Design a protein around this ligand. Structure first.
Ligand SMILES: [Mg+2]
Ligand SMILES: [Zn+2]
Ligand SMILES: [Zn+2]
Lengths: 99, 49, 148, 50, 1166, 89
């Protein structure tokens, strides 16, 4: 199996095969530890942000990939944002401080 | 496990006393379980299910 | 001779471990609840755990466990507290219904008479009917009909 | 010794304690204790070893 | 400069209690209706759980009613139905609310066994609940009459008390009561009273709880939170898109359970409003309030209570706390796993032709993976008009695109990963080589690191998209850049099986062969002699070789001589680069020697030579192994001729002991032991028959009568070379196999006399079955055990990362060889290798400094220490490092994929844990659970008690439960008397003196005791030596380093003893403490500095302590953590690995360390 | 291709900073503001940058100096333009 950019899940935006075109491989915690033991942060950030969970980041990246510019403008992963909303829906006030 | 009566032990680990223990269990094909079991004080007990 | 919950506690501590079934029956006849256990396994588990590896602090994980044992009656489940709270109210007697209804009649008719003794309560109705025949209102929005 | 640890006295009392054990939180009834206990291991409907 | 308002790159995070108004701030409207959609035109009903007016348009930039559909009109609020036309994504953002008719308890705060309302009010739970359900009254601010403030009453009691006092006495019931309670409470006054009361009465029981509560109170005050907010006024509603109503096939819908729950809450609340306006009797409105409480509680956390079930479905509806918690243990989405784009996977194959730095990548796979790159390049050169055309081209697979792919593949690395990822080598970067096929070709030498067989294991590929990812992949994750195990310096690139049998068959000699004894000018004509069939590959021959040495300063010296060697070794020498001695290839070349070859090559010539050398070694290995014609026949396994006889005699023994049991000369158990022993001996006899016979039995002649050497028999060559097979397995092939044990664990006294070469009869096999199944099951279990251990370990370390460079401490641990029992169970050189010296050590004579001060001890240095007789070296360690909140590179050590000293910012905790846990599959009191118990600090079952203080001791009192031991220190007082249970046999001499930490009894010792009584270094030595005993017993190499960092994490906490800054008994960070006292030794009070006591914490307990709550909310229990942090108003500054992973930004380590550093400095500064 | 970064690591010792600096340089080339300091073998900007690190003609110091110079290269251009902005008075 192989995938570049496929479909995406509605609830949380994450790669999901709907066409029998398969969803991406799952990058787990142990794998994250593997990237953590190596000195590679960017591989990991792009792994769990732009390549996957960032709804803006994925497209904003794709345009750069085709433009011939390799970068990332990561933003915030949609999962953690969903968790912000889920926590904040309770009587719990969660804020992002400073600047 | 076949329906009927069944006699077990649970020796060792129970209450770490080495005193063992003994329990009988009546298991119906369909219905409630009838359990009988001792304790360290040698007082017989019964529990449904 | 008695006090219950010690007993499962003191035994759970000396053994160092208790099966998930061991606490259920050894629990007092007071707290039988299913979701009761959920947090109390977490209580005994930070102090000497058996969930069948913890904090050696203990202490307040006992005093608060004794507070939950005293908290063991009211099963909550508002169907219950309701069914019980209404179950106090005494059944009505065939004549008692008439008593109460008569009391109602006395009350309402009182407020109605009090309304009729107010001049403005009259004048308002007059002006309102003056608005009805003036096509500024309708008959249904003033009266539901008189006696008739 | 088991009898010494027995809180009950007569048949009805034991039936009350059993009914209270099976379905706690709610008031016992004579017909309810009898019905339950007879319907547990003694009923041709609710019980079979085959 | 004005700081900022609108979105920037934020720092940290804050969590706290929400105000009703604060809640209303998020809310852009109140949802007044349970309705969702119109049921025909599926558009949302206005102000309902799904609403366009409150939340957002159903379609991008399009008003609901359809008035303004144009992308022009934007900030416009429509006149028909107010909807600002904006992207539908803001329906995933905007919150909502509900105004509750009656106050409602927040179930998380009400019951989460710190019942927060309860311990804030010092009011027991059952009283609070009894109030909430209107089951009794509770006083509030009772003034001065008859009654306590927190006191609770009943119906009659309240009526009576009210009749006595109309005013200046107050009581309520229900949620309103609890709210009035909390609101009326003045924290300041309570504090003022608590301090005094603390000061007056002296009792442990009193002032302990007193001081704890005052601490809690002042914390709650500084939090900014106010008690009232625990009682809900406004209830926020979650955005509709996060609880979708979205349709499906067949016209059917599907929706989150949150809609059901919220619907219940709304309906019951509205009904309560109505019942308030209709003036219902109390019996009713109370019931409605209880129902509302239930509804809200079920909406927030449905875990508690009775677990309301969703419509038509038995399964309990999933609530918001169940949305945060998730399931499958503790997993927060960034933890359990995440689906990732630009990736793939498939079955893998060999591809021996590959260089170590590359891997075969299937054509189609590479096409699909690099698709955007392919588009971009295609329209970059101008082969395609537009992106669409590029798509159409590669979809047509026009012949051109392939070449384009060859461009984008060249310098662009890819990541390869396997399923059981343990150590960091589990993922390795390679360079793609286009392949025709659907399978991924993986370099053989890497098969060791992945633990990947060829039996159908699958591997996954990832693409390093951004520039930084490509460079991270090439300079870090690259195959060739990691040639060494992070656990220990030994090469992980060591040739595996076919290759080692190749070099073994190559480098070797028989007694007589072609060209025996002749002489040749060099390896060239040696190989030239072999390839022409004139000379045998293995023959004793003198040849002229030129070996170099770099022994001159930075310079290669050349020398040449006549070496007595074999044709094969001479041929092999052509591969060996430069300064390596010929001696390395002149051996028999086994799996170990072939490894030490590569290792020495690396520590001498450098990286590149080691790489290319390794490659050539693999190629020649496979080549000559292929040429060797090595096979395995049924006659290759030779059964001892004397086997049957050993069987017979040992079978006589059993009849002897049997006849003895029949005559009663021996008991039953004694008979059993005897027979089992004689059979157990028979096994070893047959084993050491077949072993000699399979070993030296080849008898051949050179020019004489006879002579004998090591056999050229195939299976022997395999087992001996280290290719595969072992004496234990060969034993099971030829000689009889073992004695088996019944499932009971009782070993049968009738062993399996038949072997695999012979036929196994029914019984023997049936008896083997148990051991087989138990083997499979146990291995399958120890997999999970190893994984779990790795998890606890990475949880206890994690954020520990090299931070400073050199702390500059003389402190360290004393390194000597282990010297266990007989000679040297582990050398000194190994222990001190790659480690820095604490202080300059000396020759036997002094004023001579060989190793100055702190210098990394590498191969040459350790060899210099070996030259001299030096028996010990003091070495700096991670456990003794003075650096706060991390480790300095100077103290850590060297070891890495590179032989150089550890880099600044490399995360060593992760690799420590990984390196400890990876071999843990190979582990079997003893075993892996022993390792677990060790790292957990757990006190042993029947421990030994050390002497509390030095000086003469005596046995006091008499027998009740214990017989008291009274200590008598020479100079000091003797308050210390320890009551030692007397039914346990003692050790200590009642008439003799015993030093502190002596043996007052035998048995295992609790590491807490070792720490407290003996020392930090004592206990840090105990752990490492014990766990290393466990590993080394199984033949596992793990450097002391990793275990030492785990230890450092274990002892992280401490408990204060004296005072003058912080509280008495507080468990706190040694880092925090030491920082505060070292800061307090000067300035401040001249010295007020407080004493402490170092404390040993088990790994699972030490993992519990984390500053970041986002981190703790992951692996710990989510609800409790979130609540406990919320009431304290805890501010998470990030700074750690896990939290930054969750929030999805660069890790505060590795490459991102520079970023996080610079940022951390910019923060808390000008 | 560049098989072993050992020499590049040798130059700038941190080895993470190698990745960072080489990334910066590879960016200077990839979206072109600039051109290679060493012959391009068809090696992508990644490897070209790494080579540039190996030859010691590229590193944090050098790059920072060049960029700081360029700030004034552009500052000298706008010198009349921004001084024409006296309308702020
Ligand atoms: Mg396998
Ligand atoms: Zn409109
Ligand atoms: Zn240090």
């Amino acid at each position: 199996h192989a995938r570049s950019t496929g479909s995406y899940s509605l609830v949380t935006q994450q790669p999901l095969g709907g066409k029998a075109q398969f969803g991406g491989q799952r990058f787990g915690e142990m794998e994250v530890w593997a990237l953590e033991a190596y000195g590679a942060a960017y591989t990991l950030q792009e792994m769990l942000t732009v390549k996957s969970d960032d709804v803006n980041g994925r497209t904003k990246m794709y345009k750069n990939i085709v433009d011939g510019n390799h970068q990332m403008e990561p933003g915030m992963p949609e999962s953690f944002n969903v968790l912000l909303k889920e926590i904040r829906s309770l009587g719990i006030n969660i804020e992002l401080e400073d600047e | 496990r076949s329906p009927g009566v069944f006699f077990d032990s649970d020796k060792g680990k129970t209450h770490s006393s080495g005193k063992v223990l003994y329990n009988a269990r009546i298991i119906p094909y369909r219905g409630s379980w009838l359990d009988f079991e001792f304790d360290p004080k040698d007082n017989l007990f019964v529990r449904i299910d | 001779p008695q006090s219950q919950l010690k007993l499962l506690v003191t035994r759970g501590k000396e053994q160092g471990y208790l099966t998930y079934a061991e606490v259920n029956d050894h629990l007092p006849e007071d707290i039988v609840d299913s979701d009761q256990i959920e947090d109390i396994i977490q209580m005994i588990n930070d102090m000497g755990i058996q969930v069948m590896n913890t904090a050696d602090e203990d202490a307040a994980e006992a005093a608060a466990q004794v507070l939950s044992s005293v908290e063991s009656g009211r099963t909550t489940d508002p169907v219950r507290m309701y069914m019980r709270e209404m179950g106090t109210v005494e059944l009505l007697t065939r004549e008692g219904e008439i008593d109460i209804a008569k009391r109602i009649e006395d009350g309402i008719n009182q407020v109605q008479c009090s309304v009729a003794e107010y001049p403005e309560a009259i004048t308002y109705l007059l002006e309102q009917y003056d608005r009805v025949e003036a096509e500024e209102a309708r008959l249904s929005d003033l009266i539901t009909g008189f006696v008739d | 010794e088991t009898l010494r640890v027995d809180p009950t006295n007569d048949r009805l009392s034991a039936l009350v304690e059993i009914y209270r054990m099976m379905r706690p939180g709610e008031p016992p009834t004579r017909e309810a204790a009898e019905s339950l206990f007879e319907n547990l291991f003694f009923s041709e409907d609710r019980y079979d070893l085959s | 400069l004005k700081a900022q308002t609108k979105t920037e790159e934020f720092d940290a995070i804050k969590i706290a209690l929400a105000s009703p108004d604060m809640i209303r701030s998020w809310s852009f409207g109140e949802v007044k209706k349970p309705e969702t959609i119109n049921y025909r035109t599926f558009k949302p009903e206005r102000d309902g759980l799904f609403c366009a007016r409150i939340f957002g348009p159903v379609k991008d930039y399009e008003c609901l009613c359809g008035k303004y559909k144009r992308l022009k009109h934007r900030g416009v609020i429509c006149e028909k139905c107010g909807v600002e036309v904006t992207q539908t994504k803001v329906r995933r953002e905007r919150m909502g609310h509900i105004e509750l008719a009656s106050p409602t308890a927040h179930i998380w705060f009400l019951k989460s066994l710190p019942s927060r309302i309860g311990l804030l009010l010092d009011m027991p739970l059952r009283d609070i609940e009894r109030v909430l359900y209107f089951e009794s009254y509770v006083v509030i601010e009772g003034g001065m009459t008859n009654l306590e403030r927190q006191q609770i009453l009943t119906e009659e009691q309240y009526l009576d008390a009210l009749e006595e006092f109309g005013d200046e006495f107050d009581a309520k019931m229900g949620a309103e009561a609890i709210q009035a309670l909390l609101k009326s409470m003045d924290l300041e006054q309570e504090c003022e009273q608590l301090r005094e009361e603390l000061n007056e009465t002296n009792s442990e029981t009193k002032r302990k709880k007193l001081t704890k509560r005052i601490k809690l109170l002042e914390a709650f005050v500084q939090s900014g939170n106010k008690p009232e907010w625990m009682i809900l006024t406004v209830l926020p509603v979650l955005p509709p898109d996060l609880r979708p109503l979205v349709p499906l096939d067949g016209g059917r819908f599907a929706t989150s359970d949150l809609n059901d729950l919220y619907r219940r809450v709304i309906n019951r609340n509205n009904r309560l409003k109505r019942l308030l306006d209709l003036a219902a009797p109390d019996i009713i409105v109370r019931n409605e309030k209880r129902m509302l409480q239930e509804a809200v509680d079920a909406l927030l956390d449905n875990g508690r209570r009775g677990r309301a079930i969703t419509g038509s479905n038995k399964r309990p509806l999933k609530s918001l706390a169940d949305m945060i918690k998730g399931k499958q243990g503790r997993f927060r989405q960034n933890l359990l796993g995440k689906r990732v784009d630009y990736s793939g996977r498939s079955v893998i194959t060999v591809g021996p032709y590959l260089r170590l730095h590359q891997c075969g990548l299937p054509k189609k796979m590479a096409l699909e993976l690099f698709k955007p790159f392919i588009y971009g390049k295609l329209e970059l050169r101008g082969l395609a008009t537009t992106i669409k055309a590029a798509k159409k081209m590669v979809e047509r697979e026009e012949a051109v695109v392939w070449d384009i792919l060859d461009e984008v593949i060249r310098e662009h690395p890819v990541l390869l990963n396997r399923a059981p990822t343990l150590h960091r080598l589990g993922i390795q970067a390679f360079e793609p080589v286009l392949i025709e096929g659907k399978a991924i070709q993986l370099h053989p030498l890497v098969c060791a690191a992945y633990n990947a067989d060829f039996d159908g294991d699958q591997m996954a590929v990832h693409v390093p998209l951004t520039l930084e990812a490509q460079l991270e992949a090439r300079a870090l994750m690259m195959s060739t850049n990691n040639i060494l195990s992070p656990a220990n310096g030994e090469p992980i690139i060591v040739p595996s099986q076919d290759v080692v049998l190749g070099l073994y068959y190559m480098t070797r000699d028989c007694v007589n062969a072609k060209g025996e004894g002749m002489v040749l000018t060099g390896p060239k004509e040696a190989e030239r002699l072999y390839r022409s069939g004139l000379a045998s590959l293995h023959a004793r021959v003198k040849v002229r070789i030129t070996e170099y040495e770099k022994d001159a300063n930075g310079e290669l010296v050349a020398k040449t001589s006549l070496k007595d060697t074999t044709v094969g070794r001479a041929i092999l020498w052509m591969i060996v680069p430069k300064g390596l001695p010929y001696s390395i290839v002149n051996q028999a070349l086994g799996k170990k020697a072939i490894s030490k070859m590569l290792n020495t090559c690396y520590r001498i010539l450098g990286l590149k030579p080691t790489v290319i050398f390794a490659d050539q070694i693999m190629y020649t290995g496979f080549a000559y192994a292929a040429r060797s014609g090595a096979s395995v026949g049924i006659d290759d396994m030779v059964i001892p001729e004397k086997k049957h006889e050993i069987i017979s005699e040992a079978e006589a023994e059993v009849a002897e002991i049997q006849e003895q049991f029949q005559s009663g000369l021996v008991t039953a158990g004694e008979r059993y032991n005897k027979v089992i022993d004689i059979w157990a001996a028979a096994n070893d006899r047959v084993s050491k028959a077949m072993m000699d016979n399979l070993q030296t039995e080849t008898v051949i002649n050179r020019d004489g009568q006879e002579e004998k050497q090591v056999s050229f028999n195939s299976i022997y060559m395999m087992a001996d070379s280290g290719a595969r097979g072992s004496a234990a397995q060969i034993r099971q092939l030829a000689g009889m196999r073992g004695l088996m044990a019944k499932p009971d664990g009782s070993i049968i006294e009738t062993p399996i006399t038949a072997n695999f070469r012979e036929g196994l009869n029914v019984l023997q096999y049936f008896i083997s079955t148990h051991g087989a199944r138990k083997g499979l099951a146990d291995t399958a279990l120890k997999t999970a055990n190893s994984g779990y251990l790795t998890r606890r370990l990475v949880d206890v370390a994690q954020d520990l990362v090299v931070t400073e460079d050199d702390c500059g401490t003389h402190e360290g641990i004393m390194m000597t060889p282990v010297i266990e029992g007989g000679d040297v169970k582990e050398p000194l050189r190994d222990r001190v290798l790659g480690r820095v010296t604490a202080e300059d050590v000396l020759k036997p004579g002094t004023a001579d400094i060989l190793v100055p001060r702190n210098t990394l001890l590498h191969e040459q240095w350790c060899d210099l220490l070996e030259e001299n007789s030096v028996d010990a070296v003091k070495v700096r360690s991670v456990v003794s490092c003075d650096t706060d909140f991390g480790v300095c590179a100077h103290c850590y050590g060297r070891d890495l994929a590179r032989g150089h000293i550890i880099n600044k910012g490399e995360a060593i905790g992760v690799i420590a844990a990984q390196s400890i846990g990876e071999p843990g599959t190979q582990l079997t009191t003893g075993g892996l659970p022993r390792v677990a118990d060790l790292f957990e600090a757990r006190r042993p079952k029947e421990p030994a008690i050390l002497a509390e203080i030095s000086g003469i001791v005596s046995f006091g009192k008499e027998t009740k439960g214990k017989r008291r031991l009274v200590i008598t220190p020479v100079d000091g007082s003797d308050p210390y008397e320890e009551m030692i249970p007397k039914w346990r046999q003692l050790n200590v001499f009642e008439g003799e003196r015993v030093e502190r930490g002596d043996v007052i009894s035998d048995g295992p010792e609790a590491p807490h005791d070792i720490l407290r009584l003996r020392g930090v270094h004592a206990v840090t030595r105990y752990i490492v030596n014990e766990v290393q005993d466990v590993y080394r017993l199984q033949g596992v190499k793990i450097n002391d380093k990793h275990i030492e960092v785990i230890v450092r994490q274990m002892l992280r906490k401490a408990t204060i003893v004296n005072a003058g800054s912080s509280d008495f008994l507080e468990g706190e960070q040694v880092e925090y403490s030491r920082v505060k006292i070292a800061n307090r030794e000067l300035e401040a009070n001249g010295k007020v500095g407080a004493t402490y006591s170092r404390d040993l914490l088990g790994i699972t307990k030490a993992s519990l302590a984390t500053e970041s709550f986002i981190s703790a909310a992951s692996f710990q229990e989510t609800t409790r953590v979130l609540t406990e942090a919320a009431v304290a108003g805890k501010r998470d500054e990030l700074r750690g690995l896990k939290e930054n992973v969750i929030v999805g930004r660069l890790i505060p380590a590795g490459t991102g360390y520079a970023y996080h550093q610079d940022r951390m400095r910019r923060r808390a500064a000008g | 291709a560049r098989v072993t970064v050992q020499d590049a690591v040798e130059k700038i010792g941190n080895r993470f900073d190698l990745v960072l600096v080489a990334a910066r340089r590879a960016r200077q080339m990839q979206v072109g503001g600039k051109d290679p300091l060493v012959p391009e073998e068809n090696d992508k900007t990644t490897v070209i940058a790494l080579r540039e690190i190996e030859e010691g003609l590229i590193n944090n110091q050098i790059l920072d100096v060049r960029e700081r110079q360029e700030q004034q290269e552009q500052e000298a251009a706008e010198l009349q333009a921004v001084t024409a902005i006296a309308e702020g008075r």
